Amino acid sequence: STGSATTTPIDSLDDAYITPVQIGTPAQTLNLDFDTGSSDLWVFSSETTASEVDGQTIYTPSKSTTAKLLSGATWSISYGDGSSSSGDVYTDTVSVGGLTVTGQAVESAKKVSSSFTEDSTIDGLLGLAFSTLNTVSPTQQKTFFDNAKASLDSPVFTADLGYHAPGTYNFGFIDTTAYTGSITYTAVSTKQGFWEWTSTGYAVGSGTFKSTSIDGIADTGTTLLYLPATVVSAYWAQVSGAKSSSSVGGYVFPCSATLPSFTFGVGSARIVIPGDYIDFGPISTGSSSCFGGIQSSAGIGINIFGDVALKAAFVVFNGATTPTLGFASK
């Protein structure tokens, strides 16, 4: 089997991407944030505290003839941005782009933090990291991809995120028309539960490539590119007037600037992020200070190849017995 679904930016900045997902019988379609940095499929629901729902579409398990309470199971998750959610668990039929999994754990939110409530466009998350990170207790649950894997034509999914435009998540096949050149594959460590890999270096604009190993995660659920402070300083030093602002929370730059590109290495291959992809717009409405799309990871504990980097490539998440990642230009 295969599946193919379009993923759409939630706003004009590509702050996140939503993909329609069918849950239950008859189908209830919710727009979920596919997140290769986490491993829970959770949804706003009929159980979510009413004051914490503000425009989201909810899953109502009582209206699904295939829903079953997973008795005793609870979940609770906290994300790198400080947001969180928690609740109980049902199993139900879940389909993505024509690919159907029966018995998928659908984690129903009883509580969500303010950032989720305030984002009316995201009805929940669909985690695509390794199932060892799934938070369901006392019986840990498998991701959608893990459950689907055996049925897929090939044990892979691909992320083809658009810049200010829709893109595609495919399951079970590699669309050879969706990228240019060849795909370069690189090793993955699953020891932390992430799609963790080592970039071979970077360049700023037309500058020379610096060979240096940068361990990080491929994370579709993170908006920006978070890299070591040395790398990020080298980038922003090429932008007149750019500075790190503690009050804003990262690097800002004059909105009048033209940003240089940023290149990252994948083995001997190179992925070029155009400068425009690094512009996240005014820090507040009407400001002439703009927020940068490359930020320091120093306070995180891990480097994160988020959407800014991933949307410059066609990315293969290879879930074979030895997982690997593939990157191609497009």
List helix spans (H) across 171-305. Answer: 229-236
**Residue whose entry in the numeric block shows the structure tokens 């004059």:** 254
Which residues contact residue 180 at a Cβ distance below 8 angstroms, ignoring those fewer than 6 apart? 328, 329, 330
38 tagged catalytic: no
Q: Are 235 and 204 within 8 A, CB to CB? A: yes
**In this structure, what token pair is assigned to residue 267?**
């083995």
Nearest to 169 by CA among 123, 132, 226, 221: 221
Q: Is the dihedral of CA 270, 214, 19, 184 positive or negative?
A: positive
Q: Please tell me which residue in 39, 199, 261, 297 is annotated as part of the active site.
A: 199
- List the helix and strand counts (H, then E) for the chain: 4, 24
Residue environment code for 129-160, b if the CB has 16+ CB neighbours within 10 A, otherwise e: bbbebbbbeeeebbbbbbbbbeebeebbbbbb
Which structural technique was applied? Answer: X-ray
Q: Are 78 and 84 within 8 A, CB to CB? A: yes
Which residue pairs from 6-12 have beta carbons closer than 8 angstroms and sit at least 24 positions apart in sequence?
A: 6/97, 6/166, 6/167, 6/168, 7/34, 7/161, 7/162, 7/166, 7/167, 7/168, 7/169, 8/166, 9/162, 9/164, 9/165, 9/166, 10/119, 10/121, 10/122, 11/121, 12/164, 12/281
CA distances from 124 to 34, 85, 107, 204, 267 (A): 9, 10, 9, 36, 34
**In this structure, what token pair is assigned to residue 126?**
């669909």
Q: Are 15 and 115 within 8 A, CB to CB? A: no
SS3 state of residue 232: helix
| Residue 74: CA count within 13 A, CB half-sphere | 7
35 tagged catalytic: yes
18, β-bridge pairs: 8
The segment(s) of the chain belonging to CATH 2.40.70.10 are: 5-174, 175-330
Fold of the domain spanning 5-174: Cathepsin D, subunit A; domain 1 (2.40.70)
Q: Are 9 and 101 within 8 A, CB to CB? A: no
Nearest-angstrom CA–CA distance, 23 and 20: 10
**In this structure, what token pair is assigned to residue 55?**
């425009």
Q: Please tell me which residue in 33, 35, 92, 119 is annotated as part of the active site.
A: 35
What is 175-330's CATH superfamily? Acid Proteases (2.40.70.10)
SS3 state of residue 149: helix
